[PDB]
Amino acid sequence: NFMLNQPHSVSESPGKTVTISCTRSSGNIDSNYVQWYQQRPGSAPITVIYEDNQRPSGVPDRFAGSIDRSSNSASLTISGLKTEDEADYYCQSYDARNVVFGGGTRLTVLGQPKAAPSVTLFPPSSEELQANKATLVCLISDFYPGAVTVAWKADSSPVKAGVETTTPSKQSNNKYAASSYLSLTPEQWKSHKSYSCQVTHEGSTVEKTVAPTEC
Amino acid sequence: NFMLNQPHSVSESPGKTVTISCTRSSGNIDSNYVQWYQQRPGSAPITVIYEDNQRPSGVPDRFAGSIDRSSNSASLTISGLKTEDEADYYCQSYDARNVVFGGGTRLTVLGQPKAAPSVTLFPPSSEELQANKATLVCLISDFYPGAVTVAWKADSSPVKAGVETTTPSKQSNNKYAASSYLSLTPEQWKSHKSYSCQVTHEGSTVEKTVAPTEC
Ligand SMILES: Cc1c(CN2CCOCC2)c(=O)oc2cc(OC[C@@H](C)c3ccccc3)ccc12
Numbered sequence: 001n002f003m004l005n006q007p008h009s010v011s012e013s014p015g016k017t018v019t020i021s022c023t024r025s026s027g028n029i030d031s032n033y034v035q036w037y038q039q040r041p042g043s044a045p046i047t048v049i050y051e052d053n054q055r056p057s058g059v060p061d062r063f064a065g066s067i068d069r070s071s072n073s074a075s076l077t078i079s080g081l082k083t084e085d086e087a088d089y090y091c092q093s094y095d096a097r098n099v100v101f102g103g104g105t106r107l108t109v110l111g112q113p114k115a116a117p118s119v120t121l122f123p124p125s126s127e128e129l130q131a132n133k134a135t136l137v138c139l140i141s142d143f144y145p146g147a148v149t150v151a152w153k154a155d156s157s158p159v160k161a162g163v164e165t166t167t168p169s170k171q172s173n174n175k176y177a178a179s180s181y182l183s184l185t186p187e188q189w190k191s192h193k194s195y196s197c198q199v200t201h202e203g204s205t206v207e208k209t210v211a212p213t214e215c
Numbered sequence: 216n217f218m219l220n221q222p223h224s225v226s227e228s229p230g231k232t233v234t235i236s237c238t239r240s241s242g243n244i245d246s247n248y249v250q251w252y253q254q255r256p257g258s259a260p261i262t263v264i265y266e267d268n269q270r271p272s273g274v275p276d277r278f279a280g281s282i283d284r285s286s287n288s289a290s291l292t293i294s295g296l297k298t299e300d301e302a303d304y305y306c307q308s309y310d311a312r313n314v315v316f317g318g319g320t321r322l323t324v325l326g327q328p329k330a331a332p333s334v335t336l337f338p339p340s341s342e343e344l345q346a347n348k349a350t351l352v353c354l355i356s357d358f359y360p361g362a363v364t365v366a367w368k369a370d371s372s373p374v375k376a377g378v379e380t381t382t383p384s385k386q387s388n389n390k391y392a393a394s395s396y397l398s399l400t401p402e403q404w405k406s407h408k409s410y411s412c413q414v415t416h417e418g419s420t421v422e423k424t425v426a427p428t429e430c
Pocket residue numbers: 037039044045090101102103252254259260261262305
């Protein structure tokens with residue numbers, strides 16, 4: 001079947017308009033209806049759009065669904081942004097019994113100034129190595145909003161095996177920190193020329209690389 | 216409109232059976248298909264039941280959906296309860312005028328065993344020292360329950376400045392992870408013999424120590 005591709009995050013100040021795209025991988029966006037669901041943090045989801053642009057009763061007309069056949073995409077547009085619009089937004093369609101969801105888009109209504117993350121990539125420590133561990137840590141500090149995406153590369157190939165990322169937490173400077181760790185064996189860590197941590201925040205992606213050496 | 220009413224919370228111990236009910240307020244439960252979604256906190260949800268009782272590929276056969284017309288309810292029944300089943304569960308049906316979700320049910324799996332944290336201390340990266348920074352990270356993974364206290368030492372004396380610890384977050388092994396980082400100048404780092412990270416969990420302390428390495 002097809003995928004539905006949503007940006008990981010979006011942000012704006014109160015009173016502004018924000019748009020969340022939902023691109024269909026293969027086939028025609030207009031072949032099947034698209035729904036949008038809102039989840040506020042610590043809340044149950046609710047439908048804000050069904051059948052591309054239908055608004056259920058109780059959902060203000062600040063929320064608007066559209067289809068662009070040229071780009072093969074759905075969009076949810078929210079005008080007059082209010083703090084309660086801060087939530088995760090998922091688009092959803094079908095082909096046959098195949099329900100297809102997007103990955104979700106975290107919408108932040110800016111409570112403070114944007115801050116790009118400090119990203120530090122650490123190669124394995126001597127002590128963990130002699131315990132037969134080559135865990136790498138990617139430390140991500142001092143960012144707002146609190147939404148990041150982390151991907152790892154062995155040389156050039158995406159890694160999915162062994163990646164863990166913490167949920168961003170508010171630190172004493174009122175900015176967010178989190179860590180991504182890749183649990184490698186020594187044999188894996190040494191069997192490559194370099195590893196990489198790619199951090200995406202506010203659509204902007206930074207990339208750090210470490211290589212094996214001996215000191 | 217109609218509403219789907221779920222319990223707020225249920226608790227049960229491993230290997231036992233738990234049942235979550237989803238009562239339709241008006242209309243017959245069987246007029247429309249019920250879905251069940253599982254959400255681990257900080258994650259996108261996954262479909263665990265569709266069409267009242269159909270399990271997607273990769274959902275364990277311990278998850279069973281049912282309909283009871285007389286009590287106008289849907290139920291999700293989890294057999295052989297495991298710790299990874301700790302999550303929020305949401306039912307969902309159709310209004311033709313809407314997609315409606317229940318308020319969701321937090322499933323607590325009682326009697327999870329203690330797990331001591333795995334602790335890995337990383338000295339400053341080379342590249343970071345070239346950019347005039349000397350952050351140390353202490354990775355704390357695989358611990359239950361999800362509370363730790365971290366103290367840092369410069370040589371043998373307490374470090375009272377530049378320490379941050381992330382809020383522990385449940386990872387895919389259903390154990391917690393967190394990082395403590397110490398923001399030092401290159402000067403502070405080279406002026407000491409060593410720095411230590413001391414992690415206390417359930418009364419047991421684990422201490423790790425790194426030193427400026429020479430090549
Ligand atoms: C992506 C996805 C899947 C597919 N998974 C992906 C990973 O591999 C297993 C299948 C999937 O099976 O189900 C998904 C359901 C999604 O959202 C449902 C919405 C209405 C909801 C439910 C509960 C709380 C908040 C929101 C969103 C995404 C999914």
